[PDB]
């Protein structure tokens, strides 16, 4: 016999292609200032062509969308800090005073006053460091801080991901799918679901909803972080009960925090019963990989972005304990979390570079979904799972665990019993 060519038969080969963002019309229209760049709107025509007798070896810890889509955030966020004004000359020998007009806070705020080219300002204990009543910012000299423009905000905006022609996205739809290995239902879609650039540590705020699943590059390994997606959301409401006063100083214009209207610390709240129920569902799912002894201890230590629970709330960035949610021990058979506020923050663990959060006026309140947890197995009594997080990559992997980019080669050959002339 001989060989024959068939231009068009389905063929796959794993490869990496540069995808492009995808957005919505009304969503794009609602873009005051730059709460987050014009993006292509996608026609709501989800092909979702469910394939039959199909099986492609998905993967999540070697996926290339995560490294891709994380890079998109970095470049976009760098542009969010470009047009704004540097605060290079802003820092000078301060005259802060431990003024406590009201106590909830416990003297967290400071009545800072600088001899600018003589105005007072408020700064929490985090954003200022004592020097030797003289103080200075944590890192202005031998460092670089750029304040965000006051007009812009930082509320997440949903983003879809679509591949160019010649590359198709395979989406796994199996209900039970730990992340690796073959997936039975492989639905081919061009534009994925509403990925959310949620910026948060171990507590995944308001992401996609899952049974609770346990996903890990290697459980036997203590190094890799364990992602747990919740089947049922847990409401979290967290408020800043202080009306902030924004004073503009013509230096360019710095935005100092003026005296607060009437002082209660920012605080988060969690329904203790619902949290207790979900955690049992977690510990019951963990025991599948393991009866045994399970203990939860709070974050062991490290930077303030990991020791606590960092998240964004209406253009303000909160650091709060999680000792009130990870203190338990489980065998086979509302909660309020204290917080802190920081305005000079260096997200993504970058040295030198950092952004100054402009003040936001009034009492700040926000509500979100606790849908995912990041746990770190400790180094055979019990396996204490402390909350880790840290690397910003993981919070993407809780959404992109069910997508891959494949190159299609419609060309193909076959040894058919046929001959040319």
């Amino acid at each position: 016999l001989w060989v024959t060519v068939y231009y068009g038969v389905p063929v796959w080969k794993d490869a990496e292609t540069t995808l492009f963002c995808a957005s919505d019309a009304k969503a794009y229209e609602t873009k005051k200032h730059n709460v987050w760049h014009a993006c292509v709107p996608t026609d709501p025509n989800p092909q979702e062509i469910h394939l039959e007798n199909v099986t492609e070896e998905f993967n999540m810890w070697k996926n290339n969308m995560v490294e891709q889509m994380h890079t998109d955030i970095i470049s976009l966020w760098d542009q969010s800090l470009k047009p704004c004004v540097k605060l290079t000359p802003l820092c000078v020998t301060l005259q802060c005073t431990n003024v406590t007009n009201n106590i909830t806070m416990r003297g967290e705020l400071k009545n800072c006053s600088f001899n600018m080219t003589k105005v007072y300002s408020l700064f929490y204990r985090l954003d200022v460091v004592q020097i030797n009543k003289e103080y200075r910012l944590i890192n202005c000299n031998t460092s670089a801080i750029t304040q965000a423009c006051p007009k812009v905000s930082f509320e997440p905006i949903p983003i879809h991901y679509c591949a160019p022609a010649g590359f198709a996205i395979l989406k796994c739809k199996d209900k039970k799918f730990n992340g690796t290995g073959p997936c039975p239902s492989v639905s081919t879609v061009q534009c994925t679901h509403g990925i959310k650039p949620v910026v948060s540590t171990q507590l995944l705020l308001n992401g996609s909803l899952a049974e609770v699943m346990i996903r890990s590059e290697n459980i036997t390994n203590n190094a890799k972080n364990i992602l747990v997606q919740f089947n049922t959301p847990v409401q979290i409401n967290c408020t800043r009960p202080n009306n902030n006063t924004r004073k503009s100083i013509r230096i360019q214009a710095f935005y100092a925090t003026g005296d607060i209207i009437g002082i209660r610390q920012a605080h988060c709240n969690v329904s203790k019963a619902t949290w207790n129920e979900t955690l049992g569902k977690v510990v019951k799912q963990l025991r599948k990989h393991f009866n045994t002894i399970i203990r939860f201890a709070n974050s062991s230590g490290g930077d303030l972005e990991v020791t606590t629970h960092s998240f964004n709330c209406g253009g303000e960035f909160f650091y709060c304990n999680t000792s009130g949610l990870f203190n338990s021990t489980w065998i086979s058979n509302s909660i309020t979390l204290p917080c802190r506020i920081k305005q000079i923050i260096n997200m993504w663990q970058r040295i030198g570079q950092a952004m100054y959060a402009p003040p936001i006026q009034g009492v700040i309140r926000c509500v979100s979904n606790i849908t995912g947890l990041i746990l770190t197995r400790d180094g055979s009594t019990t396996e204490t799972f402390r909350p880790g997080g840290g690397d910003m990559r993981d919070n993407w992997r809780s959404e992109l665990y069910k997508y891959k980019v494949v190159k299609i080669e419609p060309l193909g050959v076959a040894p058919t019993r046929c001959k040319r002339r």
Partner: T-cell receptor
Amino acid sequence: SALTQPPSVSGAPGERVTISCSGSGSNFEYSFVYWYQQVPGMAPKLLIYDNYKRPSGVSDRFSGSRSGTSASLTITGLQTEDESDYYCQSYDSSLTYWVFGGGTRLTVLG
Amino acid sequence: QVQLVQSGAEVKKPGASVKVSCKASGFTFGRYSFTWVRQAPGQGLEWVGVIVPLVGVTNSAKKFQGRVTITADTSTNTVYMDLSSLRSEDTAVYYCARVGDRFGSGYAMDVWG
């Protein structure tokens, strides 16, 4: 902002050893801890970072963890190629200046 | 293949100044950083300084305050360290170590000259 280490700890081949790293200052509780393996004549090589993450291509017998205000590096199955100096580093993010521990010496019996 | 090539060993009279150079090996500065660590012979190493060529920010240890000058050039992918007023206390081997990864998101010292 100062880190303390044991001077020297030796281990028999094939056994498990641990090394402490204790540093004063509440900032020690607000800063990471790394560990560096350093051949007595060569350049340092990264051993573990972010207190539990192994860099790609490092032996799985190395693993450490934090404990309150101290750090610890644990090696399982010590061989005769693991004798060197081990340095624990605490990167103070606020003050923006790394600090290196004194250096702990490990020797394999033989 | 990623390496931090260096200049050769140096011998200097006390009271002088020393210049040491480090050059990339197939990459630009990008968003990475660079740092310098010295190790006295028969002694645990110690920190010296750090620079970020992307924004031109610097810092150094308190012990070497006013004695170290950290420079960078984006044209030729080189970072030079200028330490002033050498004495017997500075008889040490000086490594230049890379910091971070493709996003500058790290803090460790992984690639060493």
